[PDB]
């Protein structure tokens with residue numbers, strides 16, 4: 001039985017001011033590097049324990065002992081994502097109901113049905129880059145975010161955000177980004193009741209209304225027309241939970257749609273942006289990936305089956321997720337009093353946070369070369385020990401969108417590698433911006449077209 | 455679309471008399487040198503196409519298109535190795551079950567637990583060499599086989615073959631060697647049902663009985679005693695497949711044990727033998743390796759972490775596997791009608807053989823200096839083209855023992871290089887003996903002790 005370390009405190013604010021940064025996950029990573037596999041983090045009225053080792057995280061991932069917790073961040077996101085899958089407690093009726101309805105809509109098999117819509121947006125991206133002038137560059141996370149948001153709009157509810165037709169965001173996205181920003185900013189405030197925050201609060205309510213109005217309108221429009229499409233919305237309007245026999249109500253559908261849009265905008269674009277960063281920094285890898293894309297993607301546009309053959313491209317994506325998991329943390333609570341790791345007593349209800357970037361850097365698992373970008377670590381997926389690699393979370397509360405995200409990312413990276421050579425013309429210095437997700441802020445490249453027609 | 459070449463035929467026996475040699479792999483390598491990257495090889499009732507270029511092998515390694523085939527050789531080995539992992543089809547229930555149960559036992563993590571038992575045998579080898587008198591030499595494949603067999607016996611099922619205490623093999627080994635010899639010789643026989651071979655069949659049955667008797671007794675004895683070891687047998691007796699929830703039955707366990715014993719006796723001893731051959735033939739490389747061993751192995755016996763630090767020794771082992779892969783071929787079948795390399799049409803079920811020593815000599819990958827021994831080729835795995843280097847096979851049917859073999863070989867080669875200087879006193883001319891594996895027959899060296907304690 002041992003006492004847990006704790007980072008530096010600030011009197012009555014305890015550890016809370018350590019989150020007063022633009023880069024809180026990176027701060028927590030540095031604390032983990034200093035304090036080790038577990039540390040206590042206290043704010044007024046709450047305690048969290050941050051886990052960094054596979055030894056401890058493997059136990060936390062035992063679903064008979066620990067369940068998903070809504071972290072303070074998720075509780076704030078729940079003000080606009082409601083009881084959608086991501087911001088639901090496992091024990092809420094609407095979690096299991098929506099899970100049972102949507103799970104078939106997100107299978108590997110269901111991706112055959114989304115593939116054409118994914119290709120539509122991917123073609124838009126390739127065409128944009130083909131149309132750049134010689135003196136121009138690509139704003140990577142900006143174009144990746146255009147792609148990933150539009151893809152989930154089209155596949156999700158047959159709505160075109162038309163992000164490649166715009167400098168600034170669609171108004172809906174302006175409101176979503178600002179709502180996510182407020183949710184994340186609230187985490188740092190010592191007195192959130194201060195009237196200095198009244199304008200933030202009003203703007204938050206306005207942004208929620210904008211989001212709800214577009215989504216609610218689309219749902220109502222779809223029901224009135226009776227049209228049947230290949231999108232998640234059709235599946236949600238027709239679906240019945242085999243357990244309750246109930247369909248999702250229109251309010252719940254709206255929350256799911258908002259949830260999917262957030263995942264597309266945030267984590268998926270991050271993955272792509274980091275994958276391109278690691279490629280341009282590791283030209284042997286980029287050559288190997290480009291060779292695969294060239295030999296596999298023999299047709300003007302990729303088929304579903306061809307995307308499945310892009311093994312090395314998938315390895316690149318996994319190794320990007322290892323170093324910079326774009327959903328960097330998830331929270332758990334103890335279902336009963338218990339002891340973690342033979343050493344750390346927990347009371348029922350105690351909160352754990354899994355710090356995924358640190359798990360992915362556990363030298364006990366990965367070796368001493370943890371900071372190196374080496375996709376060949378993933379050559380033989382059989383080799384990865386259990387609960388060592390968790391970029392999509394854990395168990396029944398793992399990411400429902402994992403197949404969608406990897407299919408999209410594999411397809412897009414494949415097409416990018418087929419159609420262009422890339423140059424890190426600025427020798428970009430990695431600068432990671434934190435929202436809900438992580439992204440390489442300011443990352444720019446030049447593309448030289450290989451002149452291969454679509 | 456092209457006709458593929460074929461070597462010389464013998465009327466109705468087709469190509470089969472080309473295998474009527476005690477060095478068939480070397481014969482097939484010369485055929486590849488003459489005919490190029492693919493050739494058809496026909497025997498009465500079977501056709502297989504031998505591939506030698508990375509260009510075609512990178513396609514053959516696509517698991518969506520090709521699966522592991524039991525070559526005629528593996529079909530004969532299956533008479534004593536059963537539906538163990540090596541001689542199973544991917545679609546047999548027992549393949550996936552055993553695979554799921556045994557993967558954690560063969561992980562890089564599990565090697566921490568075998569390390570002490572590997573050290574035990576490695577110290578026996580070092581001590582034997584320390585005890586030679588001035589005018590004596592080392593019989594290299596003989597001693598390496600003593601070591602590798604004993605290591606898997608001890609780590610596999612807490613059984614000591616005590617090979618360092620014997621000139622003549624343990625009776626179990628006599629039988630296993632003679633069963634492997636029968637299996638391989640049967641390949642060359644045009645009329646296997648000639649009574650000329652009835653003595654061979656009776657001996658084959660007696661040898662299988664000898665092998666089964668020891669292994670079934672060991673399993674029974676372990677179950678009776680109830681004892682709990684750090685060995686594969688313990689994990690196989692207590693393990694349950696996560697998928698089916700079932701344990702392995704005793705028959706299957708016995709096949710797994712027999713399989714592991716074969717791999718230790720054969721391929722692993724070949725690797726160490728060729729590694730020492732290359733080192734004594736390349737004294738600058740030997741020196742660089744010896745310097746690394748001296749810098750890293752600072753304790754009387756190596757720790758697990760010190761072995762992981764022997765990076766150049768690992769590269770030496772990879773460069774030995776490049777030139778003389780001790781499992782020199784594996785077989786695949788086409789899961790569907792398909793076209794290989796845009797040129798060679800295949801029907802569902804058609805067989806391919808990957809001729810690994812020829813793949814590893816592809817000058818388009820390795821460059822002009824392909825016959826040179828240069829460990830530095832392996833400094834960066836990302837610089838190696840996809841599917842260029844396949845000594846442990848491919849995909850989900852790759853060698854489960856790879857981490858074991860490389861840990862053992864790195865350990866032993868490290869300790870050899872720390873404790874002794876080596877002399878190629880006879881200017882040995884490489885003569886490769888073929889069984890299931892390749893070994894340098896008659897390879898002898900003299901060792902001069904550095905007089906460093908254990």
Ligand code: HEM
Nearest residue numbers: 085086260263267268271327330392393397399400401405
């Ligand atoms: C690379 C991209 C993605 C990453 C890294 C990622 C990561 C995660 C993680 C870690 C969780 C677990 C959260 C927790 O335990 O609190 C999760 C849940 C979820 N993700 Fe993703 N995600 C990605 C893309 C997506 C996409 C594209 C969608 C939908 C279109 C999606 C929908 C969801 C949903 C609905 C859940 C909640 C599932 C449940 O608990 O029932 N995600 N995601």
Ligand code: HEM
Nearest residue numbers: 539540717721722780781784845846847851853854855859
């Ligand atoms: C103690 C050492 C070893 C053990 C216990 C071992 C075990 C095995 C097993 C059980 C398989 C079948 C895996 C499956 O299909 O699920 C296998 C395949 C293989 N092993 Fe090993 N092995 C060892 C050492 C080696 C070495 C040193 C080499 C080569 C230098 C090697 C080369 C291979 C190859 C090429 C295959 C694939 C066979 C094919 O596709 O038909 N093995 N090994």
